[PDB]
C-alpha cells in the first residue's frame, strides 16, 4: 500500500455534447491533478466517497471484477461487475461472498456487454442520482513507476439506470485507486473534438489565472482572480 | 485591437445571455412552448423576457 502521483490522469468527457476547438469550463467530480493515489501490489474493502478512479496494468488479466455496496451482504443491494475472457456481466443481486458468491438472491437488474479489460486500463466509477456511470480508456504505456505523464481522456464506457446505495467497494483478483472531488476544470477540445488538455482551476495560482482568463496561455501582467 | 476585442466581447456576452434561465425552468423558448399550456407558459416566458 504505497502512494503515487496521479499527474494529469483521470479526465473524462463530462457530457455527450460535441465541441471542436473550444476551451470549455465544467464543474463536476474530477480527480485533482498531481494527487496522491493509493498503490496496491497484491484487496481490502475501500470507501467509495463521491467517485472512484481505478487504474490497472496487469497482462495476466488477474483483475477480473468489482463489487460495490454498503453492507456487501444480502442485507442491502450490492452491485457486481465480473469480466471474463469473452464478456462482462453486471448484476445488482443480493450476494453473500466467501473467499465467487456463496449465495445470490433477489436479483433486480442484469446487463451483458463487451469485456471492459503494457496496456494500461483506466476506469472512473460514479454513482449520482440513481445512475452508475462508468468511463474507461486503454492506452499503451512503457515500464516505469506508473501513471505516465501523458494526457488521455476517458470516454463514457457505460451507464446503468440503477438507483442503488453505494458507500464501499472492492476489487477481485498492481492497481492504483484515487478519489474524486468537486472541481472546476478547463478542457480543450481540438479540431476533431478530442479533449487534448485540461487545467485544474484549484491546483495553483497559475491555473486559477488560466481559468479566469479562459485560456491556456497567460500574458505578462497582474490579474485579479477570486477573492 | 482593443476596440475590436471590446466589440467582439460585448457581442459574445450578449449571445451568451441567451443561455441564462433567469429563474425560468428552461432557457429555450421552444421547449417552454412544447411542454406547457399558455396559462403556465406565460410565467416562464415573462421571466425570460
Amino acid at each position: 500500500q504505497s502512494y503515487t502521483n496521479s499527474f494529469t490522469r483521470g479526465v473524462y468527457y463530462p457530457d455527450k455534447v460535441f465541441r471542436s476547438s473550444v476551451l470549455h469550463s465544467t464543474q463536476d467530480l474530477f480527480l485533482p491533478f498531481f494527487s496522491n493515489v493509493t498503490w496496491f501490489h497484491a484487496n481490502p474493502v475501500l470507501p467509495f466517497n463521491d467517485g472512484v478512479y481505478f487504474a490497472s496494468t496487469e497482462k495476466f488479466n488477474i483483475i477480473r471484477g468489482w463489487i460495490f455496496g454498503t453492507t456487501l451482504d444480502s442485507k442491502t443491494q450490492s452491485l457486481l461487475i465480473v469480466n471474463n475472457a469473452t464478456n462482462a456481466v453486471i448484476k445488482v443481486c443480493e450476494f453473500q461472498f466467501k473467499n465467487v458468491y456463496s449465495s445470490a438472491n433477489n436479483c433486480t437488474f442484469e446487463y451483458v456487454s463487451q469485456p471492459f479489460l503494457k496496456n494500461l486500463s483506466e476506469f472512473v466509477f460514479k454513482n449520482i442520482d440513481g445512475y452508475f456511470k462508468i468511463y474507461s480508456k486503454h492506452t499503451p504505456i512503457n515500464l516505469g513507476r506508473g501513471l505516465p505523464q501523458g494526457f488521455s481522456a476517458l470516454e463514457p464506457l457505460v451507464d446503468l439506470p440503477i438507483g442503488i446505495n453505494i458507500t464501499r467497494f472492492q476489487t477481485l483478483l498492481a492497481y492504483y485507486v484515487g478519489y474524486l472531488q468537486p472541481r472546476t476544470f478547463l478542457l480543450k477540445y481540438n479540431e476533431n473534438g478530442t479533449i487534448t488538455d485540461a487545467v485544474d482551476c484549484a491546483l495553483d495560482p497559475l491555473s486559477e489565472t488560466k481559468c479566469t482568463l479562459k485560456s491556456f496561455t497567460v500574458e505578462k501582467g497582474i490579474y485579479q482572480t477570486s477573492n | 485591437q482593443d476596440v475590436v476585442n471590446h466589440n467582439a466581447q460585448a457581442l459574445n456576452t450578449l449571445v451568451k445571455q441567451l443561455s441564462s434561465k433567469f429563474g425560468a425552468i428552461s432557457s429555450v423558448l421552444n421547449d417552454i412552448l412544447s411542454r406547457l399550456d399558455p396559462p403556465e407558459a406565460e410565467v416562464q416566458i415573462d421571466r425570460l423576457i
Partner: protein, 291 residues
C-alpha cells in the same frame, strides 16, 4: 424578414416496444403508502392514450408539463410510483405540501416535474387481506426527504423514557392500517394513486410518445424534431467527426449546430434560416413615390 420553413420532419428511432404501463396500473394489489412501489420506465414508446382506457380518473394533475402535450415529448427515463391512499389525502400528494402522508410516507421534490393520477378503488380494495390492511407511517422523527422510503417498524418514542423495542406509554407504533369500508363516505374512500416522474434533457431520450418518423429533408429551411430536440433550420452533410457516444454538437455560444440522426446515425450540420433587416430607399415623397 425571415425565410419561412417549408416542411416539418420528426426523426425518432426504430423503438416500437410499448411502455409497461399496463402492469403498473392494472396490478392486482398496490403496495402501501409507506412502501410505495417504484418502477423504472425506459426504452419504450410511451403511449399515454391507453391510460384513458384504464380508469376515469378524477385527478390527472401535472407539474411542469401539460397533460395534452405528453404524446409529443421524449423523456430520458420515467419513475412510476404506485400506492393506495385515502381520497381526502390525495391533495397531499403535491410539491410543497405539509401533512402526515406528505412528510412521513411520500414526499415530492420542490422542482418535481411529472404527473399524478388517482382513481377510485372502492370496488377492488374494500375486501379483506391487505386491501383492508393498507398501512401508512404516522410518526417520524424528521420529515422524509423527497423520493425516500422508510419501511422500518421502529417504535416511536414520544416521551423521554426508552421503549426498549416494546410498545407502551409514549411508545407508539407508527405503522397504522386503514379502515377502508364500502360504507364510508367520500371523505374516507380508498383511491389508487400513481405518480409519474419524468427526466428530461441531459441523457439521450429513450422514452417518447407515439409520434411517427417522417423522411429526411436536406438543404431546405424546415422544422426538425430529433428525439425531442425541436428546432428550425437547414440540415446539410457535415464533416464533423462525432465520437460514438456523442449525439449533438454545440458552438462557442453553446447553440446546437450539429446533430446525429437517431436512425441513419449520420451527422447533420444545422444552419439557421436566413434573416435580416429590410431597408426602404426613397427620395422624398415630394419628389416621387418610387422606392
Amino acid at each position: 424578414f425571415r425565410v419561412q420553413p417549408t416542411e416539418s420532419i420528426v426523426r425518432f428511432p426504430n423503438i416500437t416496444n410499448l411502455c409497461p404501463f399496463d402492469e403498473v396500473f392494472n396490478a392486482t394489489r398496490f403496495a402501501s403508502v409507506y412502501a410505495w412501489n417504484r418502477k423504472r420506465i425506459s426504452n419504450c414508446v410511451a403511449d399515454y392514450s391507453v391510460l384513458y382506457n384504464f380508469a376515469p380518473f378524477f385527478a390527472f394533475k401535472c407539474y411542469g408539463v401539460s397533460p395534452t402535450k405528453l404524446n409529443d415529448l421524449c423523456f430520458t427515463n420515467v419513475y412510476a410510483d404506485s400506492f393506495v391512499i385515502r381520497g381526502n389525502e390525495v391533495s397531499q400528494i403535491a410539491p410543497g405540501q405539509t401533512g402526515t402522508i406528505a412528510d412521513y410516507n411520500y414526499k415530492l421534490p420542490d422542482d418535481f416535474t411529472g404527473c399524478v393520477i388517482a382513481w377510485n378503488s372502492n370496488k377492488l380494495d374494500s375486501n379483506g387481506g391487505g386491501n383492508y390492511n393498507y398501512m401508512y407511517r404516522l410518526f417520524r422523527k424528521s420529515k422524509l426527504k423527497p423520493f425516500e422510503r422508510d419501511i422500518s417498524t421502529e417504535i416511536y418514542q414520544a416521551g423521554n423514557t426508552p421503549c426498549k423495542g416494546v410498545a407502551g406509554f409514549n411508545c407508539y407504533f407508527p405503522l397504522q392500517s386503514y379502515g377502508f369500508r364500502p360504507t364510508y363516505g367520500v371523505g374516507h374512500q380508498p383511491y389508487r394513486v400513481v405518480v409519474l416522474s419524468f427526466e428530461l434533457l441531459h441523457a439521450p431520450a429513450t422514452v417518447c410518445g407515439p409520434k411517427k418518423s417522417t423522411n429526411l429533408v436536406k438543404n431546405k429551411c424546415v422544422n426538425f424534431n430529433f428525439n425531442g430536440l425541436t428546432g428550425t433550420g437547414v440540415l446539410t452533410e457535415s464533416n464533423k467527426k462525432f465520437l460514438p457516444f456523442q449525439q449533438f454538437g454545440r458552438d462557442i455560444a453553446d447553440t446546437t449546430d450539429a446533430v446525429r440522426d437517431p436512425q441513419t446515425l449520420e451527422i447533420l450540420d444545422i444552419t439557421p434560416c436566413s434573416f435580416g433587416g429590410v431597408s426602404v430607399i426613397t427620395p422624398g415623397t415630394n419628389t416621387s413615390n418610387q422606392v
